[PDB]
From a paper:
WD40 proteins are a subfamily of propeller proteins with no intrinsic enzymatic activity, but their stable, modular architecture and versatile surface have allowed evolution to adapt them to many vital roles. By computationally reverse-engineering the duplication, fusion and diversification events in the evolutionary history of a WD40 protein, a perfectly symmetrical homologue called Tako8 was made. A different computational approach was employed to redesign Tako8 to create Ika8, a fourfold-symmetrical protein in which neighbouring blades carry compensating charges. Tako and Ika are the first successfully designed eight-bladed WD40-repeat proteins for which structures have been confirmed crystallographically.
Author numbering: 2 to 320
């Protein structure tokens, strides 16, 4: 069931992230909007971007967004003003992640750039990729980046060098997740690969998808991936076997998220689907979107989804 349909975005919503009392949405209208999830009304419209917003991340005080204008901006989430503009990328910024000290941005110019968040200076520039960087993730020591060059590269977050290059994918890498033990990468070649992060060798290749893999997520036991073949698949990470295939969507799966109990997926068929992961059976179909679903996020009881119809919708996860 839909509770609140947030409105005021004039173009497709690309990214979102919500807490207990606010939602932060990025869209193709070059604006970032802050809303009150309870009332469903807009508080602040963050302006300064000259093209579509591709990703975002916020904490209690700060919002960090990436846009198609090759800039990463840092916003005060309460006053609505822009604090820093980070300039160094020469093409669209596709992914971002930031902590207390630094921000890390991936771009179409095949470079990952590290910036000390309170300075705005370009600390490091990670060179090595031959095409657009699509996804990234870093911890205290290292950075793992995916790119259109069909390779996943590991870097040292402070030395600025490349540690390993994970090779085997025959098409662009779209998503990645990693721990100190392994990395998990999805690619356009319809395969998900599990690698040993320490040595950079391929531990397994998950096969079964008939088209590009768009999103993934894994815990200690399982990998959950969504593909362009309108299906979500469950895998066993150590075995490499296919566990369950979730079938209900009639178009490509774009975003997903899961826990020990359920799997919440978004697709281009304008529907968000909640499934019991143990069964592999659909529990609900969230309807109300008039166009493709681009991003989602859920907690214990509600789901927040963004769609191409320039709307952000809140859903009761099981009501």
């Amino acid at each position: 069931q839909s509770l609140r349909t947030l409105q005021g975005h004039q173009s497709a919503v690309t990214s979102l992230q919500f807490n207990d009392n606010i939602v932060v949405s990025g869209s193709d209208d070059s604006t970032v909007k802050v809303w009150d999830i309870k009332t469903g009304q807009s508080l602040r419209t963050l302006q300064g971007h000259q093209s579509a917003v591709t990703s975002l991340q916020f904490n209690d005080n700060i919002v960090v967004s990436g846009s198609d204008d090759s800039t990463v901006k840092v916003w005060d989430i309460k006053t609505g003003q822009s604090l820093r503009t980070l300039q160094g990328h020469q093409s669209a910024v596709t992914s971002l992640q930031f902590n207390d000290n630094i921000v890390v941005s991936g771009s179409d110019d095949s470079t990952v750039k590290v910036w000390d968040i309170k300075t705005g200076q370009s600390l490091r520039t990670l060179q090595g990729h031959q095409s657009a960087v699509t996804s990234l993730q870093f911890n205290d020591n290292i950075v793992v980046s995916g790119s259109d060059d069909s390779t996943v590269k590991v870097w040292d977050i402070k030395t600025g060098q490349s540690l390993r290059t994970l090779q085997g994918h025959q098409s662009a890498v779209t998503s990645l997740q990693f721990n100190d033990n392994i990395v998990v990468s999805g690619s356009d070649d319809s395969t998900v690969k599990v690698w040993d992060i320490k040595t950079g060798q391929s531990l397994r290749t998950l096969q079964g998808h008939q088209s590009a893999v768009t999103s993934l997520q894994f815990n200690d036991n399982i990998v959950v991936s969504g593909s362009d073949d309108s299906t979500v698949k469950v895998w066993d990470i150590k075995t490499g076997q296919s566990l369950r295939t979730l079938q209900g969507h009639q178009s490509a799966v774009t975003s997903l998220q899961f826990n020990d109990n359920i799997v919440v997926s978004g697709s281009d068929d304008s529907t968000v689907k909640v499934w019991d992961i143990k069964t592999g059976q659909s529990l609900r179909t969230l309807q109300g979107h008039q166009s493709a679903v681009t991003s989602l996020q859920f907690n214990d009881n509600i789901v927040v989804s963004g769609s191409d119809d320039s709307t952000v919708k809140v859903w009761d996860i099981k009501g």
